[PDB]
Ligand binder design. Structure first.
Ligand SMILES: [Mg+2]
Ligand SMILES: [Mg+2]
Lengths: 294, 294
């Protein structure tokens, strides 16, 4: 995978970020989510590398990046800290400004990065997510059941860590395959093994739990404080139209207040649509990036 | 434990209910909750047996009672089904009417039994619970985090079953001890070993998960249909004042619309106060039962 891309472990502040870099053209940072890592972009990145310098990076707590022990207030795993790492990675790789695409946690990191450092983000695509603030503030019995892990993973360490660690493949496969009878079909075998191998690392089990602890505390408070602001660069809300999120919330409604320049796109898949629709994901991203740059 | 009590496995229809019976005087049925069984009453029952014929029974899906495979609609684990079993158990043991005390799932079973067969329940004590309907209709980010298991346990079989199955002791200890520093202290070793035998039983892991799946579906719907109806017999709302519940809800507010004759009592413990305050629990239940009968 990532034939021809340079593989780099870059020290940024107090953590090291694992990434692959390939291509030429404007920089494009692709950030993964849970329970995955930069390998979710194994097919999409090579397709866009004919026009962009594509960087796929692992968020702190995931894949090959540092996984520090979470602080009692979880602040070292807020999206502000996660975004800072990635923005500094890009600056180190020589890119002061860059386009950003983020799925799941990576989209949340991107949203926070655009609010914290508007000048660094040329465009923002958030894949299959609604704002973290809305997820919690408007939770109801249906949202809490669908997103049960948003609450289980917030339990104090080391409880989720020990429960997950007793059989991580079973635990994460549930988060990845979800409950449809299609469920595991469609994942590329090679990318799926990268999710498996990397998630069995107890330090990554811990780091991802800390990301979720922060989400419901520090991130929620930071997001609350920024409700009077909008992301100003061109933005794309890109959803899996056959997924649970597209079904419980209206994209326009939850995002319009956060994005000053918003476009929409969807593919007929679920939350992990990038895994099943690599080529079409690359196509939609390329069209949006072209629109953004115009 | 339960010295002098008779052990009975009683067929009530399509399930068999495990119970112990002791004492003399009016019938008193004590129903346990999650993640426990009739042994949570090992100290309280002998104290009350000097004035009541005390029956401590295992709910279907728990302890030594039948644990059928959950139906796709979870109806065989509704509180209506669980209540029917216990009312028939009492009738078979010779009692058409009895006092009822329930903690956690057992209190939910009791509320539903009083709504479905008011003439069979002479008095109803609900221990450390607020109504199922409220738990779900008024959920917010704090409630969902505190009662995360109400959402994890609703995930489709066999997922929670396999996650829990990999390390039952770690999973249920977190449910029983909680996150506080004095979490594990103060549980009687003998009673704890009986809860543990259940924790490790795959059929009980499944049964309890199905109880939670029904609670969020069939039970919520049945309860919705009965809003406005109040149980008429004397009732006691008995809570652990040092616990989470007492902290997020007001007992008066959530129970008043459900109980026409309501009294209150509390002990300075958490959700599992019965384990820590057997003598005082019996004292309070004795005082309430006397008041009820008078
Ligand atoms: Mg976070
Ligand atoms: Mg039930």
């Amino acid at each position: 995978m990532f034939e021809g891309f340079e593989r780099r472990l870059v020290d940024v502040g107090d953590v090291t970020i694992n990434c692959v870099v390939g291509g030429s053209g404007p920089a494009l940072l692709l950030l993964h989510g849970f329970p995955q890592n930069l390998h979710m972009w194994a097919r999409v990145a090579p397709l866009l590398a004919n026009e962009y310098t594509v960087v796929c990076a692992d968020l702190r707590g995931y894949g090959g990046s540092s996984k520090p022990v979470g602080a009692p207030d979880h602040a070292n795993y807020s999206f502000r800290a996660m975004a800072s790492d990635q923005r500094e990675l890009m600056r180190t790789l020589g890119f002061e400004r860059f386009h950003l695409v983020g799925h799941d946690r990576g989209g949340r990191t991107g949203h926070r990065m655009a609010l914290d450092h508007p000048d660094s983000v040329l465009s923002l695509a958030v894949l299959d997510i609604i704002p973290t603030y809305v997820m919690f503030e408007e939770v109801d019995r249906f949202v809490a059941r669908a997103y049960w892990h948003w609450y289980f993973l917030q339990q104090p360490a080391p409880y989720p860590e020990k429960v997950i660690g007793a059989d991580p493949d079973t635990f994460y496969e549930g988060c990845l395959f979800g409950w449809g009878a299609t469920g595991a079909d469609g994942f590329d075998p090679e990318q799926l093994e990268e999710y498996r191998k990397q998630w069995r690392d107890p330090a990554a089990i811990h780091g991802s739990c800390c990301d979720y602890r922060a989400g419901g505390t520090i991130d929620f408070e930071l997001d609350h404080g920024d409700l009077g602001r909008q992301v100003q660069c061109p933005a794309l809300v890109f959803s899996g139209s056959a997924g649970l999120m597209h079904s419980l919330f209206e994209m326009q409604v939850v995002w319009a207040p956060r994005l000053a320049n918003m476009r929409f796109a969807s593919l007929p898949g679920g939350h992990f649509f990038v895994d099943r629709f690599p080529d079409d994901t690359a196509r939609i991203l390329r069209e949006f990036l072209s629109d953004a740059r115009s």
